[model samples]
Target: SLFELGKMILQETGKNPAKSYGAYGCNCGVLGRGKPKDATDRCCYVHKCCYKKLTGCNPKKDRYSYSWKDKTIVCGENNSCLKELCECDKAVAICLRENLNTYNKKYRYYLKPLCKKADAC
Candidate 1:
């Protein structure tokens, strides 16, 4: 599915659409910003990674249209694309862990935390 597709992209391009702490959390260090599929962060410690919108700011980079689901990211700037969540699972997990305390205060166990496994969120 999307996972495999992400894997293939990562393998081929040596770049995955995932971000990690070091990049340390999402735009708010809170929620994963709806956890876009192709979120990359240049600030990430991991090289050749995805985007993470700045803290407390919503970015237009990680776009997910209703029709596409996980198929294609429609970023107009910064070379973003709709990618597989599997590629970003580690990033999502990192975001959740780093920001869990903050998230819990606001969300209070809103949805099941993502990226518990090696697959997509």
Candidate 2:
């Protein structure tokens, strides 16, 4: 089947089918949005959304986001930052809805975007 063959080719090439085709939105961390590249691969949107939120470096907007880094932390990877901040957002949401006591303080703390050292990306 062409569909099956396509999936196989995409997997072998390490290409995200949704991303390569045209799936959109901040549906990165969501499980049902789409499939991942591999077992360890997170959704593409999560990586982009997280990276943009953390570093203000949107590859779609700024070319700098794709630039090479000299030395940086693990958050340097757009996917890594996306995973980190996405979880952060979830935590804040949970705290706001369930724990009203410290929600305000926690919300304020989470409002600050996680950032990485980069050259104006």
Candidate 3:
């Protein structure tokens, strides 16, 4: 299997697992937009949608964000954007964990494209 051998060689060199994984759309934290790596990636998109719908935050700016640490926490506590964003992050975090097995399966994912500039075939 040349693909396997090539994959092995690529691994030896150091591969971008997140980028070259399954169907794209910001896998875990990386940026992509093909289909989706798994349910985890699906969650990322859903979370982003929630961000767009409810907050001033845009998708590209907070692409793969799922926690306050990743983005600035502007809104204050009681029934505000803070609460909404928190719920968004929390839901995705929960969904991601629930489907972590499928996400885990793509660990060593190898191809040759980040769908931005690294693609070549």
Candidate 4:
């Protein structure tokens, strides 16, 4: 299946599954681009960890080409490989909780509210 194949390839490269956000309500808080502007701030908080991994906001540093989805790079600018989502999930959950009300209002695109499971990888 696609999930299994994708999961294997990512793991072989020391990465978490590419679409690994089941633990969260939505990755909007992590990947959203403030399109309408109202959602930008909350998105930043959600993607804080990932952002820390980025080398720079450029084609090479943050590439996600159609041919190599697994090759995508994010907030780990200082490292050659990136951290798994689970590695930062606890911190992300806490950040969201800290700004729960703001996140709820800013991230209406998420069907469910921010997940509050502590230490849930």
By lDDT, who's the top model here?
3
The residue ranges of model 1 lying beyond 4 angstroms of the native Cα positions read 1-85, 105-121
In TM-score terms, which candidate is top? 3
Q: lDDT of each structure?
A: 0.32, 0.31, 0.43, 0.34
Least well predicted 10-residue stretch by lDDT in candidate 3 = 1-10
Which pairs of residues collide in candidate 3?
none
lDDT of 2 by residue, 21-111 (tens): 2322222222223333321223332343344556532323322122113521122225654444434333322322232332122212121
- Kindly list the per-residue Cα lDDT of model 1 for residues 13-33, writing each as its tens digit: 243434322223233223343
Residue-wise C-alpha lDDT for candidate 3, range 1-121, written one tens digit per residue: 1222123223332334334333334334444433444565666556556655665543233322222344322323354554565556556545654565565444334242542232111
Query: What TM-score, over all chains together, does every model reach?
Result: 0.21, 0.23, 0.47, 0.29
Off by over 4 Å in 3: 1-27, 31-33, 56-76, 105-121
- How many residue pairs of model 3 clash at the backbone? 0
Better lDDT candidate (1, 4) = 4
Assess candidate 1 and give its TM-score to the true structure: 0.21
Candidate 1 minimal-lDDT segment of 10 residues: 39-48
